[PDB]
Amino acid sequence: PTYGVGHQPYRVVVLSFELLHAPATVCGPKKSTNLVKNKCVNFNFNGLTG
Amino acid sequence: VIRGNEVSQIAPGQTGNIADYNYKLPDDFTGCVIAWNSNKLDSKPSGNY
Amino acid sequence: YAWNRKRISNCVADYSVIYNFAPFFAFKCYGVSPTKLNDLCFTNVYADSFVIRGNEVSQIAPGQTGNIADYNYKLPDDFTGCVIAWNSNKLDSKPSGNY
Numbered sequence: 001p002t003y004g005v006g007h008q009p010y011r012v013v014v015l016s017f018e019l020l021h022a023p024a025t026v027c028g029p030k031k032s033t034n035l036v037k038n039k040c041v042n043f044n045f046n047g048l049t050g
Numbered sequence: 051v052i053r054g055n056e057v058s059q060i061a062p063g064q065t066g067n068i069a070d071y072n073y074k075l076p077d078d079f080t081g082c083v084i085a086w087n088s089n090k091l092d093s094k095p096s097g098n099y
Numbered sequence: 100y101a102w103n104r105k106r107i108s109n110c111v112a113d114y115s116v117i118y119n120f121a122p123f124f125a126f127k128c129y130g131v132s133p134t135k136l137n138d139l140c141f142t143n144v145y146a147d148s149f150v151i152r153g154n155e156v157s158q159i160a161p162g163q164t165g166n167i168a169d170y171n172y173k174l175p176d177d178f179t180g181c182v183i184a185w186n187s188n189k190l191d192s193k194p195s196g197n198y
Protein backbone atom coordinates (compact mmCIF):
# COMPACT_ATOMS: atom_id res chain seq x y z
CA PRO A 1 0.00 0.00 0.00
CA THR A 2 2.97 2.38 0.41
CA TYR A 3 3.88 2.15 -3.29
CA GLY A 4 3.22 4.86 -5.85
CA VAL A 5 0.10 5.27 -7.95
CA GLY A 6 1.72 3.55 -10.95
CA HIS A 7 2.50 0.39 -8.97
CA GLN A 8 -0.99 -0.24 -7.59
CA PRO A 9 -2.77 -3.50 -8.48
CA TYR A 10 -5.45 -3.21 -11.16
CA ARG A 11 -8.26 -5.69 -11.80
CA VAL A 12 -8.76 -6.15 -15.55
CA VAL A 13 -11.82 -7.67 -17.23
CA VAL A 14 -11.56 -8.03 -21.02
CA LEU A 15 -14.73 -8.65 -23.03
CA SER A 16 -14.19 -10.06 -26.53
CA PHE A 17 -17.19 -10.18 -28.86
CA GLU A 18 -17.50 -12.68 -31.70
CA LEU A 19 -18.70 -10.64 -34.69
CA LEU A 20 -19.33 -13.53 -37.08
CA HIS A 21 -22.03 -15.12 -39.25
CA ALA A 22 -22.95 -17.80 -36.71
CA PRO A 23 -26.56 -17.75 -35.43
CA ALA A 24 -26.99 -15.28 -32.60
CA THR A 25 -27.10 -16.62 -29.05
CA VAL A 26 -26.20 -13.72 -26.71
CA CYS A 27 -27.06 -10.01 -27.14
CA GLY A 28 -29.11 -7.16 -25.72
CA PRO A 29 -32.79 -6.71 -24.94
CA LYS A 30 -35.02 -5.58 -27.81
CA LYS A 31 -38.67 -6.51 -28.19
CA SER A 32 -39.42 -8.49 -31.35
CA THR A 33 -42.45 -7.43 -33.38
CA ASN A 34 -44.47 -9.32 -35.98
CA LEU A 35 -43.02 -10.01 -39.42
CA VAL A 36 -44.81 -8.47 -42.41
CA LYS A 37 -43.92 -9.27 -46.02
CA ASN A 38 -44.41 -7.57 -49.41
CA LYS A 39 -44.27 -4.12 -47.80
CA CYS A 40 -41.57 -1.43 -47.86
CA VAL A 41 -40.49 -1.48 -44.20
CA ASN A 42 -37.46 -0.93 -41.98
CA PHE A 43 -36.07 -4.22 -40.71
CA ASN A 44 -33.73 -5.23 -37.88
CA PHE A 45 -32.41 -8.78 -38.28
CA ASN A 46 -29.93 -9.65 -35.49
CA GLY A 47 -28.41 -6.18 -35.26
CA LEU A 48 -27.98 -4.78 -38.77
CA THR A 49 -30.70 -2.51 -40.15
CA GLY A 50 -31.87 -1.46 -43.59
CA VAL B 51 -4.71 -8.67 -12.05
CA ILE B 52 -1.76 -6.65 -13.37
CA ARG B 53 0.24 -3.65 -12.20
CA GLY B 54 -0.67 -0.05 -12.99
CA ASN B 55 2.21 0.72 -15.36
CA GLU B 56 1.26 -2.13 -17.74
CA VAL B 57 -2.46 -1.40 -18.13
CA SER B 58 -1.55 0.25 -21.46
CA GLN B 59 -0.11 -3.08 -22.66
CA ILE B 60 -3.65 -4.56 -22.79
CA ALA B 61 -4.35 -3.27 -26.30
CA PRO B 62 -4.04 -4.64 -29.85
CA GLY B 63 -0.61 -4.39 -31.45
CA GLN B 64 1.50 -3.78 -28.34
CA THR B 65 4.99 -4.87 -27.30
CA GLY B 66 6.26 -5.37 -23.77
CA ASN B 67 6.18 -7.90 -20.92
CA ILE B 68 2.50 -8.81 -20.51
CA ALA B 69 1.79 -8.53 -24.25
CA ASP B 70 4.77 -10.56 -25.48
CA TYR B 71 5.05 -13.25 -22.78
CA ASN B 72 1.86 -13.34 -20.67
CA TYR B 73 -1.33 -12.19 -22.44
CA LYS B 74 -1.58 -11.08 -26.07
CA LEU B 75 -4.57 -9.47 -27.83
CA PRO B 76 -5.02 -10.03 -31.59
CA ASP B 77 -4.44 -7.36 -34.22
CA ASP B 78 -8.09 -7.39 -35.41
CA PHE B 79 -9.44 -7.41 -31.85
CA THR B 80 -12.96 -6.13 -31.20
CA GLY B 81 -14.51 -5.70 -27.77
CA CYS B 82 -13.90 -3.72 -24.60
CA VAL B 83 -11.17 -3.57 -21.96
CA ILE B 84 -12.25 -2.71 -18.40
CA ALA B 85 -9.70 -1.84 -15.72
CA TRP B 86 -10.10 -0.38 -12.23
CA ASN B 87 -7.90 0.13 -9.20
CA SER B 88 -7.91 -2.62 -6.56
CA ASN B 89 -5.79 -1.14 -3.78
CA LYS B 90 -8.35 -1.96 -1.08
CA LEU B 91 -8.54 -5.71 -1.80
CA ASP B 92 -5.38 -6.83 -3.62
CA SER B 93 -2.72 -5.07 -1.52
CA LYS B 94 -1.03 -6.15 1.71
CA PRO B 95 1.69 -4.51 3.84
CA SER B 96 3.70 -7.74 4.04
CA GLY B 97 3.78 -8.16 0.26
CA ASN B 98 1.54 -10.21 -2.01
CA TYR B 99 3.02 -13.46 -3.33
CA TYR C 100 12.85 28.22 -14.63
CA ALA C 101 16.19 26.54 -13.89
CA TRP C 102 15.64 23.02 -15.26
CA ASN C 103 18.60 20.66 -15.55
CA ARG C 104 19.99 19.31 -18.83
CA LYS C 105 21.80 15.97 -18.77
CA ARG C 106 23.69 14.80 -21.86
CA ILE C 107 23.45 11.06 -22.56
CA SER C 108 25.94 9.63 -25.03
CA ASN C 109 28.11 6.59 -25.87
CA CYS C 110 26.12 3.85 -24.13
CA VAL C 111 23.46 1.18 -24.58
CA ALA C 112 20.02 2.37 -23.51
CA ASP C 113 17.35 0.03 -22.11
CA TYR C 114 13.93 1.72 -22.11
CA SER C 115 12.10 -1.19 -20.45
CA VAL C 116 13.59 -0.57 -16.99
CA ILE C 117 12.12 2.93 -16.80
CA TYR C 118 8.80 1.69 -15.38
CA ASN C 119 10.47 0.28 -12.24
CA PHE C 120 12.05 3.65 -11.37
CA ALA C 121 9.03 5.96 -11.08
CA PRO C 122 5.27 5.28 -10.69
CA PHE C 123 3.98 7.01 -13.82
CA PHE C 124 0.88 6.08 -15.81
CA ALA C 125 1.47 7.36 -19.34
CA PHE C 126 4.71 7.16 -21.31
CA LYS C 127 3.40 9.98 -23.51
CA CYS C 128 5.66 10.17 -26.57
CA TYR C 129 5.25 12.37 -29.64
CA GLY C 130 7.61 11.54 -32.50
CA VAL C 131 7.94 7.82 -31.74
CA SER C 132 6.11 5.03 -29.93
CA PRO C 133 7.16 3.72 -26.47
CA THR C 134 7.04 0.09 -27.65
CA LYS C 135 9.61 0.64 -30.44
CA LEU C 136 12.34 2.45 -28.48
CA ASN C 137 14.70 -0.55 -28.22
CA ASP C 138 15.00 -1.65 -31.87
CA LEU C 139 15.98 1.61 -33.58
CA CYS C 140 18.49 4.01 -32.10
CA PHE C 141 19.37 7.70 -31.98
CA THR C 142 22.34 10.08 -31.91
CA ASN C 143 21.90 11.89 -28.58
CA VAL C 144 19.37 11.80 -25.73
CA TYR C 145 18.63 14.87 -23.60
CA ALA C 146 16.66 14.79 -20.34
CA ASP C 147 15.03 17.84 -18.72
CA SER C 148 13.94 17.65 -15.07
CA PHE C 149 11.57 20.07 -13.32
CA VAL C 150 8.67 19.99 -10.85
CA ILE C 151 5.45 21.74 -11.89
CA ARG C 152 1.80 21.85 -10.82
CA GLY C 153 -0.91 19.42 -11.88
CA ASN C 154 -2.77 22.02 -13.94
CA GLU C 155 0.42 22.82 -15.88
CA VAL C 156 1.18 19.29 -17.15
CA SER C 157 -0.79 19.82 -20.38
CA GLN C 158 1.48 22.75 -21.32
CA ILE C 159 4.50 20.44 -21.80
CA ALA C 160 3.56 19.84 -25.44
CA PRO C 161 4.44 21.31 -28.85
CA GLY C 162 2.33 24.27 -29.93
CA GLN C 163 1.05 25.24 -26.47
CA THR C 164 0.44 28.61 -24.80
CA GLY C 165 0.14 29.40 -21.11
CA ASN C 166 2.65 30.20 -18.37
CA ILE C 167 5.29 27.44 -18.40
CA ALA C 168 5.31 27.09 -22.19
CA ASP C 169 5.95 30.71 -23.22
CA TYR C 170 7.99 31.92 -20.22
CA ASN C 171 9.66 28.95 -18.48
CA TYR C 172 10.19 25.91 -20.73
CA LYS C 173 9.36 25.84 -24.45
CA LEU C 174 9.17 22.72 -26.65
CA PRO C 175 9.72 23.15 -30.41
CA ASP C 176 7.02 22.70 -33.02
CA ASP C 177 8.95 19.81 -34.65
CA PHE C 178 9.63 18.12 -31.30
CA THR C 179 10.44 14.42 -31.47
CA GLY C 180 10.87 12.84 -28.07
CA CYS C 181 8.77 11.75 -25.14
CA VAL C 182 7.34 13.28 -21.95
CA ILE C 183 7.11 11.49 -18.59
CA ALA C 184 5.20 13.02 -15.66
CA TRP C 185 3.98 11.59 -12.36
CA ASN C 186 2.62 12.74 -9.00
CA SER C 187 5.06 13.70 -6.24
CA ASN C 188 2.84 14.44 -3.24
CA LYS C 189 4.73 12.12 -0.86
CA LEU C 190 8.13 13.75 -1.49
CA ASP C 191 7.68 17.36 -2.68
CA SER C 192 4.98 18.68 -0.34
CA LYS C 193 4.93 19.87 3.27
CA PRO C 194 2.16 20.80 5.72
CA SER C 195 3.94 24.09 6.48
CA GLY C 196 4.25 24.90 2.77
CA ASN C 197 6.92 23.98 0.21
CA TYR C 198 8.68 27.19 -0.85
Ligand SMILES: *[C@@H]1O[C@H](CO)[C@@H](O)[C@H](O)[C@H]1NC(C)=O
Pocket residue numbers: 119120121
Ligand atom coordinates in the same frame (compact mmCIF):
# COMPACT_ATOMS: atom_id res chain seq x y z
C1 LIG D 1 17.23 6.36 -5.88
O1 LIG D 1 18.35 6.52 -4.97
C2 LIG D 1 18.03 6.26 -3.59
C3 LIG D 1 19.29 6.52 -2.80
O2 LIG D 1 20.45 6.15 -3.53
C4 LIG D 1 17.53 4.82 -3.43
O3 LIG D 1 17.15 4.60 -2.08
C5 LIG D 1 16.33 4.59 -4.35
O4 LIG D 1 15.93 3.23 -4.28
C6 LIG D 1 16.69 4.94 -5.80
N1 LIG D 1 15.53 4.77 -6.66
C7 LIG D 1 15.31 3.66 -7.38
C8 LIG D 1 14.07 3.66 -8.21
O5 LIG D 1 16.08 2.71 -7.35
